[PDB]
Design a protein around this ligand. Structure first.
Ligand SMILES: [Cl-]
Ligand SMILES: [Cl-]
Ligand SMILES: [Cl-]
Lengths: 259, 258, 259, 261, 259, 259
């Protein structure tokens, strides 16, 4: 659709159209690797998307192709940190969809993993690099990967640091669907619109519920936090707000203790 | 406070008054040990209390004293008690164990899984499993550790000693201690304080506490409460509203809040 | 298999034959949606199967086809509620197999998920509906689903509310096998018979062990509870009851402290 | 202490001295209840402290006493983007020790704030309790589960279901307050505790904090703990080969490093 | 009582009497700090105790007093490392009781923590030292300590590295009881005798159940492992062995599916 | 590969070459079932591999084929225990790869599961046997299996005790790749070599990180233990060691408190 520029950044591009935001890593001369400035700007853009009551879905992608003809989603750290960014993407009450063309490698692979969903172009290439280049992500990069592809495949991914095609990535369970390169944005927009027709409260509650299977008390904070928000929107929940407004004690005596 | 009989049982007594239910193990000649019939009746009475929209708090105790002047809450084993443990733990009403005299063996785990415990100062706590030929490695172990910490929980089970009411409060498993003649009255006061609270807030908090212990089963409770709350919102109304005007639900107007 | 009726209900059917029980959701005029009475009747039937010592396996299915030729397993929602039923199916020490012909949708899809196993007809259709119709299951419907199909696919299922074929369902890991519709019951019976020839104690312990990877202390309650039951059936564990009958303190002094 | 003002806000005060930051909720006319701006400012101050390499310890407190002589640490949400859940997470996860110095009321949302701080020092006049079920709210997140990891399941449920108030001495006995001191010694005690921490190894301290969160926060806790391991790795000889190799334009070679037991 | 030396070591002493073993760290000139050989020898002694069918309880203590009149249990660090030793003490199906006179400090403090129980002399002194001396134990030293004294107190212990008296330690929940130093061994023996009169199978199952609340799948391995052991001791269990004693398929057809 | 004998055993063979160790179960006349002697020797060999600083990868396999032409990896217990062995394979900081030709059955199936990775020959056969023969593994055999193939497939594997081909095993997620039997050792060696060129510290940290998603505090012990090891190798961590030598208090004053 007719995207409009939402904010200006050095290392990324940021657009909105209706209920969809699009965040584009824009360092194709570095295979869309993030430097600290890029992490800061990504974090800032995702915060903005979080603040916007109109935005229900964020598409995350890399600018491409580069002038060498190759595509990259994100190739990781360029040789707030990315852990802050991982947490924001994971916990924000909007659905984030990674649209991966070409390389999603290293820190860039973990970025795709922590997005709710991933749509891959058929030229996409996935994998980790840490043990080969001198790093590791033993956080969401390991445990959460295992909750997606299972323990055997997740260990293989990290120990060997091989590259995996889009088809292999879908088969192992870490990519939701694969489409041609020229259909990638359209597919992302279609999936976004399907989500945008849903109940925003139901969606945010489900996202918290999925996090709660992984994130212990931090997941409980998100899930219970949503319960509190819902409570505020009930008749019983509003008795507190109005009892104070009229300067009287709150009275919950008329409310049932449901089974 | 006028208790009135709610149901009749062989092994237990069951009363209600206002928003409080009282369940009384009534086998003082057996030190209030539970037989299979007793568990069934206890399960049935707790189900009734769960079903009654008027009841917010359940007081659980044992009849006493016996002819010899000494009390028992529940002395353990004479539908299984695991089912009963789960019902007490998960029902969206606050359960308060009122312990006079012995709370021992299966009877001690009974007090543990109640939300709160108020003890008479003559109360006696402890496990018997390893001594008599049994064990509770479920809530009797892990949940006990979430109350008194790992060192004390292991001591309780490995040695099978008896602990006074003051010791039980000191180690964190008893909320307060009063003379035996004030036990019921204390239970009533605490119940009344809970009964003036928001019922939805209380039930959500109970699920939240269970959720720190029971993994996905705990999530089922917490999330289940989120769904119930959602049904009571305008956005959650749109479902039924639509369900009733043969139109598609329409959530277009609703914000995506931060 | 010559089924005999074990108990009469309004909304469901309940048969037994040897070690197999069959529970049939019987509201095909409403696509086998459950009303509260349906849930109550389902709960009672499962309790009965739980309490019958000869029953080792329960087959859960939906009556079909409807007059229009279309099949339904369960289309979801039309005191005890479905959460109580979910727990009973999940924790009862007998294997429960969902036999899914046609739609397993909404609450009906979560019902299939919490059954130990799912055998699907090739016409079966799977999916959630909550965010689209005004509900959600953030309990076993989310977390447990993630333990079956992984986090990426589980989020996709809930956020988009699409429909999935039996074959797509098996591929993602949530259906154990797919057979033609006229072979579904016979496949269920065959799987049941293979289980019925196994050690009942081994089977119940394993079911508890699987639940223990999900349900924290409640899972431990099942696993440890099974350990206690086994303990009672041992010589050392019989000494307690024996000593009590001989009116003497239990004596364990001869028993070794094994490594 | 020679405090210097680090930044100006409307609802709070923010000071630094050596390796200590002090964040003071400053709405004593509202019993130090937070409104949205207060939460924004607290978040900003804690971010600043996290970013300052010199700061190892943050003391969190409320200005007092009010005109009527009553003290408040924080009385929760003001009944007159970022919410306190974001603030709870920042305090919990930032790799600096946060000590709540509680004079008077730490109530409602203000009670949960004290809980998520690493440590709590209470004045003799401190009062603790939740209010949600009474006023029409609840915190089923760190306010419940984390509270249970501090005082145990029995006392935690009591605190929430009855919404009573607890003295400093009671809070210490139940395990949620680290020590109790006279109110005119409260700041001194905080500074002293801060100083003992500031003489420790910063890496060891941050790894420990992550290790404690890891007992509670599942994979998010793993992210912090493993995140610290990655950071430590970067500071080892073997971890440096990656950087050296890139800067010498050559394949990283780990061939000579042992596989230790 | 009349201890008998079980095996000779350089850095420790190892005794047995009846169902009790006693392991004594014996480097009082080093405040009973452990060097690598000490850890090796302790591991060997605990292994021997695990393998001895007559031994139900191990008392762990430090030799004292030193010639300057001061006592030490263990003052911390002076192949196998202490992490292996921590795991063995924690998982072995015998009850381990730390008997602490004087200093239990640094790695020595964690050693007391991972023992099932701790009895302290009134002269005992507890605390951590890592952040002060240049180390940390973020494993059982942190998380498990929090399962004993709560999160507030556990953090204080580690961040400040102060020393705590026996009374303070008991009050915070990490010491089970406090006795005068000249009653310390006697108290340990009495507790051991009380455990030794219990059912060994019940004790080992409970120990596994406690670990299972902390150690995820590793805890499940212990608890389920005990269930398997109990199963082998049942009639239904023995059918497997006996059906193999006769080379005829195992037949579990007569066994009920209990509720 | 120029294998050299590392140690001599009755029931197994043990070789090293460069950074690779190879452990071969050598009872083909018993379809490579393990007796207690076999478990002991396997434990000892894996311990030796853990201790050898040159060894980064261990290949575990069964000798084959037997004289009848059929292959076995390990057929389970032969009609220190295997739980100790499971723990050692799972926690040791070297990558273990199961190379499965023919049957990996019963206890032998769980053995393949707990290895980091599995490469199967296309003649490989996988399955559990417990409920059929009179046993069960409700520890890593259940829960960890579920973390690999999902809850539905894992329950099917145990409840029915069927046999699965190599292709079926790969499809469900528990086998990493499948090759002809005459390529099995070469494929294992190739995977080993790719791991051996990686950073050993990164690899061991990742292995602990994966275990930490399963093993609660025991997993934290491994992951935090690696953090402590890394800390000792930093400048700041060295101050502790240097300060003790110079008879002085450690001085951490110059070190920053990083964000
Ligand atoms: Cl109290
Ligand atoms: Cl002061
Ligand atoms: Cl999985």
């Amino acid at each position: 659709m007719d995207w409009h520029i939402a904010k200006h950044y050095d290392d990324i591009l940021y657009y909105k159209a209706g209920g969809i935001a699009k965040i584009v890593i824009n360092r194709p001369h570095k295979r869309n690797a993030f430097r600290p400035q890029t992490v800061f700007e990504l974090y800032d853009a995702f915060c903005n998307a979080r603040e916007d009551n109109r935005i229900g879905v964020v598409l995350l992608t890399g600018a491409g192709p580069h002038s060498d003809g190759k595509y990259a989603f994100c190739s990781g750290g360029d040789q707030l940190n990315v852990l802050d960014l991982q947490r924001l993407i994971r916990s924000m009450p909007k659905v984030v969809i990674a649209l991966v063309a070409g390389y999603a490698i290293g820190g860039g692979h973990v970025l795709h993993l922590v997005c709710d969903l991933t749509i891959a172009a058929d030229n996409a290439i996935f994998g980790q690099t840490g043990p080969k280049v001198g790093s590791f992500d033993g956080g969401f990069g390991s445990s959460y990967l295992a909750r997606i592809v299972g323990q055997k495949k997740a260990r293989e991914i990290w120990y060997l640091c091989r590259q995996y095609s889009a088809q292999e990535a879908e088969r192992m369970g870490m990519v939701n669907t694969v489409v041609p390169v020229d259909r990638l944005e359209e597919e992302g927009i279609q999936w976004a619109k399907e989500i945008l027709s849903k109940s925003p409260l139901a969606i945010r509650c489900l996202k918290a519920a999925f996090n709660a299977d992984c994130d212990g008390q931090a997941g409980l904070q998100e899930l219970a936090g949503n319960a509190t928000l819902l409570y505020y929107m009930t008749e019983e929940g509003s008795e507190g707000k109005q009892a104070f407004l009229e300067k009287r004690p709150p009275d919950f005596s008329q409310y049932p203790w449901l089974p």
